[model samples]
Target chain A: NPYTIYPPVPKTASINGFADRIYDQIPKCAQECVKQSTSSTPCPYWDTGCLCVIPNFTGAVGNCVASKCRGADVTNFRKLAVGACAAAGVWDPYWIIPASVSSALDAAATA
Target chain B: NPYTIYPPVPKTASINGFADRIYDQIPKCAQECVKQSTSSTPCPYWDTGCLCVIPNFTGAVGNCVASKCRGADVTNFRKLAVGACAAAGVWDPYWIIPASVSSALDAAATA
Candidate 1:
């Protein structure tokens, strides 16, 4: 059990549920951020490839950040990420526990 | 937009978290409950296959019940189930939402 200390029930759910909502939401942000662009160039994290990769992440997030998110714009990223955390009840950031630690799992749980 | 309504997430976390705890806890319960038994044949639900089957459930739950959980004991099941609900900060039942409905998904989200 040393390798894992399962979060108390609600916290686990909230952290994951919050992350799920973020995963689902940020892609929209990526999509939305992309639409605001004028060029044919694709944003890395906002691009078609990287967006879906994290939700079902199989390995380290480092792998994802390296290949898919290399050149994502800092500004739009924050607008989207910051906005994502502010969303109501289920996704609201307030419900999740303080980040003394978080999952090292590559993928989030789904049901 | 109509087919699913994701719960506001702390509740989602709690519910799934509760279920996850039960999934992990019950098998141990099964192991414990079985240890209290004199019979050596096998028990359903608590049996090796069926127990793990539901935690990482696939297809329909009905399939699990049919193939693995056919004759599970009712009494010890509650002892395990109720005890699971009572466990600590994450799993404590009050955090979960009322079950006006629940997932029809066979497999849970795994990270």
Candidate 2:
């Protein structure tokens, strides 16, 4: 199979820090999917709203940033679906999670 | 003229923090352009290489980030042209500046 080539790494403190910090917010279980992907590094994915995620291996977690979802590599269908739903206008797609988790993101811009 | 409406502010910690931090590195002379724009708030502009700049008002300084240049409101044609050339493969357009400033971006991924 022809594997996709990742873009050259970002060269902005904002981009690097944004990716690192967003990866910190993802859940443990979901992160494993990225950790165990065929690529040793986390498989980066994007949501239609432009959210990007990279799995966290050492901590069983992950991070994300606002990004276009066109290039995501689908490994976990459920997670991808939730991302899709959110893109389709369901602002709170994670019904099972506490409202705070979703609402917490509202303040992300100020941080 | 029908002024463009800005998108909702980004709700990603990475995005906000990234934008704020990048805005800190811009030059003083150039920053005034953003501050003096009719919008009052700095007008954000993007470059094809995906660099974004927001003018600064308080100290005549500004900041920038990696961003796509598609939606920029062009106030400075010279600046916009320089950004365009950089997008067309001129890695170091600012020949007058030190290499360290441009090369410094290479390590942005690790930040």
Candidate 3:
């Protein structure tokens, strides 16, 4: 599980770009998730690590992410993100996301 | 080597801060090294990964990293950087630095 998404990066993606993009995004996404409900910690609706809002936060006020970007299932999206980070070179083995965000993601997987 | 600096972060440093700070620095550190040598791919004057110039790049114009930061032998500094990354969580296993930068670091280690 490495706590990242699956399939990592694309065949044509540059390692630097792939790593840079994901490391730069996931935290932001999770931080944004916090915004809709309160401080906007960005739980991120998409595992792509972007600020896209998922069905979980649909129609919620204070959300900044786009819905279209979250076009995949929550689990698959997360898998893709972690996978990308792993393949691209920025994988965070220590589980660096906020504890709250981590709990939220875990809750989603089992639900 | 994991290609990062050591002590990776400080004892009191927050995990997120540690990861963020390191992820934010190493590449730039190497990039800065490139800058001074003309393109500054940032072989990094220090493995700590700041723009600190090393004994190797001393008095060399086109350098952006500071010298003190690279105070330790280049090899030790690199070990520290990688160690820190591993400890804090932003270790890039795929060797993501520029080819030239990677070469420069390797050359430093053996020579």
Q: Name the candidate that leads on lDDT.
A: 3
TM of each candidate vs. truth? 0.20, 0.21, 0.28
After TM-score superposition, the amount by which residue B24's alpha carbon in candidate 1 deviates from its true location, in angstroms, is 21
Total colliding residue pairs, candidate 2: 19
- Per-residue lDDT of model 1, residues A1-107, tens digit only: 11022222222332233233445444332333222221211112222221211222212222222233323333333334434434421123322211211121112
Ranking by TM-score: 3, 2, 1
Name the top TM-score candidate. 3
Over A8-83, each residue of candidate 3 has an lDDT whose tens digit, in order, gives: 3223322222233344334344334333431242432233222222223322311222231232233443543444
lDDT of 1 by residue, B7-42 (tens): 111223322333444454443323322222212223
The digit string of per-residue lDDT tens for model 2 on B7-104 reads 12223333232223223333333333333222333333322122233223211212221111111222232243232222222233411123342233
RMSD of each: 16.8, 16.1, 14.7
Candidate number with the higher TM-score (1 or 2): 2
Among these predicted structures, which one has the highest DockQ? Answer: 1
Candidate 1, superposed: residue stretches over 4 Å from native = A1-54, A57-79, A92-111, B1-16, B19-111
Model 2 chain B is weakest, by summed lDDT over 10 consecutive residues, at B62-71
Q: How far is candidate 2 from the true structure (C-alpha RMSD, Å)?
A: 16.1
In candidate 2 the C-alpha lDDT for residue A102 amounts to 26
Taking the tens digit of each residue's C-alpha lDDT, what string does model 2 give over A41-106? Answer: 222332211122211211122222111011222223235535543433323331112223223323
